[PDB]
Amino acid sequence: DGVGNASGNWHCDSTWLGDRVITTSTRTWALPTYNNHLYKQISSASTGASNDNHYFGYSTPWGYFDFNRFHCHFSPRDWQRLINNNWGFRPKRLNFKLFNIQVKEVTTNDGVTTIANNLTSTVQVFSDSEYQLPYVLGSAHQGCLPPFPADVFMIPQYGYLTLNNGSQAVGRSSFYCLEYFPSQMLRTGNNFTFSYTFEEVPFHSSYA
Amino acid sequence: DGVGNASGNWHCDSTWLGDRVITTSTRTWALPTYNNHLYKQISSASTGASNDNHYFGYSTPWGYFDFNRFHCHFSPRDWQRLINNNWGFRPKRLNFKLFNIQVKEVTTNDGVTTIANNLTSTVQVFSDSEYQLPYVLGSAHQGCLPPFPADVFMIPQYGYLTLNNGSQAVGRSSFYCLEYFPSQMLRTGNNFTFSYTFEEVPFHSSYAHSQSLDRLMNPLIDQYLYYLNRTQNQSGSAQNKDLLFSRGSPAGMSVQPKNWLPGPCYRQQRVSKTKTDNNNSNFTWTGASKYNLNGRESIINPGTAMASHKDDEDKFFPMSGVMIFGKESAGASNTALDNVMITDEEEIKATNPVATERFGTVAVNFQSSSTDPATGDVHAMGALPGMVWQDRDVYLQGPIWAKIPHTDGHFHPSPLMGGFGLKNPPPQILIKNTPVPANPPAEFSATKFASFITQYSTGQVSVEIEWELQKENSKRWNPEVQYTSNYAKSANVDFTVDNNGLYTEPRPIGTRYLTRPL
Amino acid sequence: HSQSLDRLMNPLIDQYLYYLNRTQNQSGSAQNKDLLFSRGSPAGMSVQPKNWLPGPCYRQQRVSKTKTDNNNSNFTWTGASKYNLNGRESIINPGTAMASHKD
Amino acid sequence: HSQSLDRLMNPLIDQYLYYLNRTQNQSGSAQNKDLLFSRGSPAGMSVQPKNWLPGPCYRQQRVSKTKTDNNNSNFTWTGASKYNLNGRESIINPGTAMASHKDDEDKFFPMSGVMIFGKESAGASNTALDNVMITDEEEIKATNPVATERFGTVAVNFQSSSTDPATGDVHAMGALPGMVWQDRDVYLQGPIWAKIPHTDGHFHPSP
Amino acid sequence: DGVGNASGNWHCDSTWLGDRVITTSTRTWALPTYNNHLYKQISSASTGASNDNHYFGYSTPWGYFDFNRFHCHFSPRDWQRLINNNWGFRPKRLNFKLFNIQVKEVTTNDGVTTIANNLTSTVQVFSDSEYQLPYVLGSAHQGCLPPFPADVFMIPQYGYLTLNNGSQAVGRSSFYCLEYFPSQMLRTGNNFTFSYTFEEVPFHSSYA
């Protein structure tokens, strides 16, 4: 509980139990300000695209965490110790944690830009556990956790697409204001945790 | 519990209890950012080295704490109060603590670089208590705690070596990411503590022997065992070959039947401390005792614990058979003799051979009426049964422990630098600054980060080892040899600071001062 | 082992122990015999003070698997390492556990 | 021991391990260098793969009990195995527990490798052979080397198409792993115990 | 318990009880950095002195508190109310306290030297209650508490003398590293207190 007190430790171990493996993975992140806090609507009119590449959507000032690659959780050794003596695997439950938050204010003055430290600024975090936003994950995008644990990554920008009569909207094109979701404002001494349990999915056939 | 609250006190006392001494030692440390947070791989390709000096490894952004010298825990007074009235010592348990952490961010602006104070930045500390990283400690490196408690030191950089086909890797060369270890992120109000218990190691022999190994007999009484004395008569008429046996022998002690043997040997070379009493060559690689491991050579250095020189022949030292420490104003390459501290290892002359001379001679052939009996010269000698020795002396400057390598076999696991061989040594405590990046751009880019905030941390660190003493039980009459300071009109007191605050150690202090019979 | 015995050091940090480096000066005027000690040595690892020793030895003889890279003799009894027990000999075979060949 | 150390095998059954047998063909046409391996070997027991080693060694010198079968010298200090402790020498005497002599070669004793007791009417200096009792230590010949002869030979150099394979002669041998031995025999006249010296290290503390 | 919380009050009263007087006295102090953190050894070689004024010693980066003058505890009125109607006095017990610690970092830049405030820097304080350092007090030196309570004083530098064969040391000249004493590192929210009881000393004859 900050200021001079850390709100979480670096857990990045991987305990192989008997008929299960628990993989933990901590990363350092960085989140800029996107769109200068605006809900800019994006489309394909300004681009001059083909008929196939037209889109209509909305870009948000919100970031999103994605850990949807296998090297975000498995080292190359733990992958080898997985693929070579197992006929299958599936995830049972995850456990997310967001901690040691540092909000930094930057101020430009003749290219001698100093970075100071806002102790009172907050960060809004919510997990959409009711699946009522467009699920942009599961689309093989960049901006995951890095493969190597000693890398600092940059959080992507959340932006969704909806229905499009070409490069124009249809009356059923949805619009989502994400400040109409209950967030958790996290000042520098606070942390975000939630837990998730995967439903019954079949084992991946890790065999020929 | 910070910010405005200290998370530990300065403990640097040394309580001498009855059959034990507890030494505490706090130091102020400083930790930079190494490799700019990168895992740079290091090898010998860019260096242009010889075949012997090739390596392949990995340097890390992690630091490590090392307190593997005896002056990190003992003052010169507590060392004197240890070596002079104890026949042994060994460590029982240590107790590590890391406290009062201050992470400072530095910012350059036209050489008017200001240092500010990150209250929210963290520091990752873990102790590898399962010994699954390469144990770079136990290698006599710099960057320990300083000898003098009022010095601020800089934490070294952790970097390991692995298998190398020359300057290239082999498929079995391991790679260790140290962020794949559970750390403890320490913001400025937090502290790191752990405790360690040493396993059963034998006491260090902090004594000399008061009696030689070849002089363990009664000088007044002869024996019942005989030896062959003459193979030729003194009748002087001719070659009168006759086997003459003799009861033996108070008047000749070199020819009595003995019962034990002096220790192993591996000869070094005479280097006198007078330059004129040396061969005009170099002679420090071509004529040095060296071992061959995977086609490349390495000087033994020091090797087998042996006596440095013969009696009243104090000027010769074995070429690589002694620990050589350094005084200040010594360079890192080709320093003069006046800047080093060459240790002598002549208190173990009673059991151990001279390092610079053979362990005796053996027979070569079969003597007959024609073939005169030729002998050879044993230079290296392994372990025979019935063989006793003493290990290498520890010093106030020198190392405390080392890790016994995890091998299927090992003979007498005492390190050749002296100290305590430990299968499970004190674990490596590794520490780094958490990377706090600078401003990311407005749009997304997955080429991760080259722009960090240039920062460093400082703090205090206190190590507390408890040592089990072994009291003398001596029934010696006359006074024994002590470590005294020369009471004379001196310009500078030994083991104190100078006119401008440089702490110097004028000579190496061993621990073999008391005596006991063999 | 993932690590050699003569390579158990930190390749980044030097030591506090010194070794004799030169027994002759580089002044090149004459036979300038002088004992030059050196702090040692991240850049030379063969000359650092070590702490352990490699195991025992009892040498065998080079037999290549290519017949042309061998001596034209036999050489399998006359030039083999053997022990003498009660006046009669016997090849060690295998003997001391040692590496078969160099890198 | 009722069985030698180099004879611990089944004399009826061969092995699955092979050894290099010939480095040259019997075709006799030329220098036909060829590596011939052979399954081995009930008919040759000196070349089988063994599993242990005979004990340590430190050679003594042949002194026969017949005066004529000796060198005409003295030869009892100049040609004796001795150790060097603090610049001064001392004969080992007896030293490493080793066999006194080879089979059916009972007249040679090692110069200082045997316990030599005394009968009565023996003097204290330069007594004759008829007044002493030289012990024999040949019952440990099964595990221990002969005191008066090498513990085998080792290689010296690298054999090639030019350098013929030279061997050396091991005279003193320390402790290798995989090495067994028997200690020196006790006698009715000889000592019972001794004190192990109070040292930091000592190898196999038998006197 | 700091930062924004004072760790002691200003007590400077003087209660005259019946057969005793309790004098309290608070002062503001200032402690520089001496010797640039070094144990500089001092002697009389560089001075060029007489035989009588030779010395050999050691100066330390440590300060010391001294309150060994009578006006550090008595006002001129309380002294008059002591000397005029008492045939004697002696001290029974003292009670020391060190509080409201402020560590200030100064930074020079073209003579526009700013003084900032280290919230995390510590101050090491110990009382040598076993008398195993050279007792430089009881020598009538400067650097006590000031007589007047509204003065800020500067803590002296600790430095001792030992045995001297002229301007050189003798083998029995002691050397004392003061970081070989258990200190109490005091960050800005911490305080130092200890208590002392005087042994039986005779009353001072405050009479003619």
Numbering used by the authors:
A (entry chain A), E (entry chain A): 219 to 426
B (entry chain A): 219 to 736
C (entry chain A): 427 to 529
D (entry chain A): 427 to 633
Paper text:
The final resolutions of the cryo-EM reconstruction were estimated by the FSC 0.143 cutoff to be 3.07 Å for AAV1 alone, 3.30 Å for the AAV1-AAVR complex, 3.18 Å for AAV5 alone, and 3.18 Å for the AAV5-AAVR complex. The binding of PKD2 to the AAV1 capsid resulted in a conformational change at the βGH9-ɑGH10 loop, which is the counterpart of the βGH2-βGH3 loop of AAV2 and has conformational movement upon AAVR binding. Notably, in the third region, two arginine residues in AAV2, AAV2R585 and AAV2R588, directly bind with HSPG or its analogs, but the corresponding residues in AAV1 and AAV5 are serine, threonine, or asparagine residues, which do not have long side chains with positive charges.
Because of the broad differences in their tissue tropism and transduction efficiency and the absence of pathology, AAVs are the promising vehicles for therapeutic gene delivery. Adeno-associated virus receptor (AAVR), which is a glycosylated protein containing five polycystic kidney disease (PKD) repeat domains in its extracellular portion, was recently identified as a key proteinaceous receptor for multiple AAV serotypes to employ the post-attachment events of viral entry.
